[PDB]
Amino acid sequence: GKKVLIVYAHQEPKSFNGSLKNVAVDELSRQGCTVTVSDLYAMNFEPRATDKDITGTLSNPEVFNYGVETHEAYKQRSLASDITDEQKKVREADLVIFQFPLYWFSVPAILKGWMDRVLCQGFAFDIPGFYDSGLLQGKLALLSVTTGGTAEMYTKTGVNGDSRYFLWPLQHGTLHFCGFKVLAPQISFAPEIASEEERKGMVAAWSQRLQTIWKEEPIPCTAHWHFG
Amino acid sequence: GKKVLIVYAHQEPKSFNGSLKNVAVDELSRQGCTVTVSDLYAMNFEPRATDKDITGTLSNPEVFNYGVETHEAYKQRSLASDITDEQKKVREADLVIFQFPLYWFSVPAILKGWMDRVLCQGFAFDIPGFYDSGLLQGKLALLSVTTGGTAEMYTKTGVNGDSRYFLWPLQHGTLHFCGFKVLAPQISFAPEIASEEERKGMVAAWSQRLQTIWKEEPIPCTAHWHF
Ligand SMILES: Cc1cc2nc3c(=O)[nH]c(=O)nc-3n(C[C@H](O)[C@H](O)[C@H](O)COP(=O)(O)OP(=O)(O)OC[C@H]3O[C@@H](n4cnc5c(N)ncnc54)[C@H](O)[C@@H]3O)c2cc1C
Numbered sequence A: 001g002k003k004v005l006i007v008y009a010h011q012e013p014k015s016f017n018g019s020l021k022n023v024a025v026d027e028l029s030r031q032g033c034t035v036t037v038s039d040l041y042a043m044n045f046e047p048r049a050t051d052k053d054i055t056g057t058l059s060n061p062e063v064f065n066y067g068v069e070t071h072e073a074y075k076q077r078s079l080a081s082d083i084t085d086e087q088k089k090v091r092e093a094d095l096v097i098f099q100f101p102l103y104w105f106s107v108p109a110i111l112k113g114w115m116d117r118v119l120c121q122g123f124a125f126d127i128p129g130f131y132d133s134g135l136l137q138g139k140l141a142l143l144s145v146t147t148g149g150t151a152e153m154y155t156k157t158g159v160n161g162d163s164r165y166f167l168w169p170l171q172h173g174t175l176h177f178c179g180f181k182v183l184a185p186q187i188s189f190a191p192e193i194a195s196e197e198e199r200k201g202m203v204a205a206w207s208q209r210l211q212t213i214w215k216e217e218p219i220p221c222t223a224h225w226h227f228g
Numbered sequence B: 001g002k003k004v005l006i007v008y009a010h011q012e013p014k015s016f017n018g019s020l021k022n023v024a025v026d027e028l029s030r031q032g033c034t035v036t037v038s039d040l041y042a043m044n045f046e047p048r049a050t051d052k053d054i055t056g057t058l059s060n061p062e063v064f065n066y067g068v069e070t071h072e073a074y075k076q077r078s079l080a081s082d083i084t085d086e087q088k089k090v091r092e093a094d095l096v097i098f099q100f101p102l103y104w105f106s107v108p109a110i111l112k113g114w115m116d117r118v119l120c121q122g123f124a125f126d127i128p129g130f131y132d133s134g135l136l137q138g139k140l141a142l143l144s145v146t147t148g149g150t151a152e153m154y155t156k157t158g159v160n161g162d163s164r165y166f167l168w169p170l171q172h173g174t175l176h177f178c179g180f181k182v183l184a185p186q187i188s189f190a191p192e193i194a195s196e197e198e199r200k201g202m203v204a205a206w207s208q209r210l211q212t213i214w215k216e217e218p219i220p221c222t223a224h225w226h227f
């Protein structure tokens, strides 16, 4: 038995991202997995890192440091409840899937906000207790990303450079840093340009991959893998 | 003369980021430059890309495509006023400085939101106006970043890898894509672990660099430079 959290960042239920999220839910549910989705836009998830995220007495009310105060709030259990709700989902998950369209070679701001606010010191990592020693060790993570650009544009000699280049801050800087084992990304290239057959094919490829996801090994999340 | 926009993303006026923004204002003002600051947290800037970003009626009320809708809204002068207020500042700017603490090898979400919502198709880029032909061509941009990790950690064989690795999506994927000439990043490594005078020294070096900012040539914003 396994628990899966899908963190989902798209405004439109009928979108290609919506479909990839839905097929994930369908297929994991079919397998008998326990599945939770955080639909960030539907939740109106707060992306801003602010002093509203701590409810108790601040450690240093004279000079607000978000990282310091949230670390302390985590230990004290005085974080805002929207944060702790997400932390509970992550804590219990065996696999966390991020489903999102690429926005400026990265995640949409609403999802960046989830990373900034949910993955606080004490919960996701400590010093020491990061990268291979991160607090979310044992967990798997996977980026399921859609793009405007074609596969050709995301090559070493394409205009955008290789797709692995933009994965670095997310796979290494974030997921690996927290101790996740990172599974190979699912990149669904240019669904807007693609034909009806091609789009249905990309959806089916994701569904098919998920059939055997529990048998996958993670990538070596290193500079070499990303950059060569 | 010259116009500068500083897009600033820190919660605390007394912060090291706050000090860097303040000396940028001081020095550029001293030079006679026109200076505007977008203090995102003070503005409670909206980071989320939503249908509220379009006023009046949507291009397609049945299926919402943020990219299409905002492109059309830009052309039809129907974007939300927070977005258009920022676009005006950007349009008029000769130099855009981003001042922020590194969050997860990237910009804080509030600043990511500024990028997502302000830099829409038709304004910041289109086909074929991208990279070298981007619609903001002729403008300069500069990332002024502070880190928690020390300089040593950001070496190519350090735990975090080279600083240039995380700069790719921001400098190339975003700034260069919009046509910006990208000035060398100002990176202030690990201010929190002091010292008082080392902190004073980093602030001072930023101020000093700003003295001859208009003399600078942009970096070659390429895969080779970063990797
Ligand atoms: C969500 C989140 C994600 C993060 N991700 C990363 C990451 O991926 N990689 C990474 O390396 N780091 C990361 N960090 C750490 C973060 O980048 C640093 O905490 C931040 O850069 C420090 O800058 P600051 O302005 O907040 O420092 P401050 O704490 O504000 O400054 C340090 C000290 O300088 C003092 N000071 C202010 N002005 C002056 C002055 N003029 N002269 C002398 N002293 C002065 C202040 O009083 C303070 O005591 C993350 C932090 C958070 C909260």
Ligand SMILES: COc1ccc2c([nH]1)c(CCNC(=O)c1ccco1)c1c3ncccc3cn21
Pocket: A066, A067, A068, A120, A121, A127, A173, A174, A177, B104, B105, B148, B149, B150, B160, B190, B193
């Ligand atoms: C403050 O609160 C926070 C919150 C989140 C952080 C964070 N600090 C740091 C910096 C951690 N300290 C140090 O390396 C340090 C302290 C002294 C010398 O080096 C980092 C990251 N560094 C790399 C990759 C992802 C990171 C997320 N985060």
Ligand SMILES: COc1ccc2c([nH]1)c(CCNC(=O)c1ccco1)c1c3ncccc3cn21
Pocket: A104, A105, A148, A149, A150, A153, A160, A193, B066, B067, B068, B071, B120, B121, B173, B174, B177
């Ligand atoms: C309006 O919707 C948007 C908003 C912002 C975008 C965007 N599309 C695209 C994809 C642009 N299309 C194509 O490559 C393309 C070619 C042929 C058909 O499509 C990109 C980016 N691509 C690379 C780097 C940054 C980017 C920012 N943005």
Ligand SMILES: [Zn+2]
Pocket: A171, A172, A173, A176, A177, A220, A221, A222
């Ligand atoms: Zn890694």
Ligand SMILES: [Zn+2]
Pocket: B171, B172, B173, B176, B177, B220, B221, B222, B223
């Ligand atoms: Zn470039």
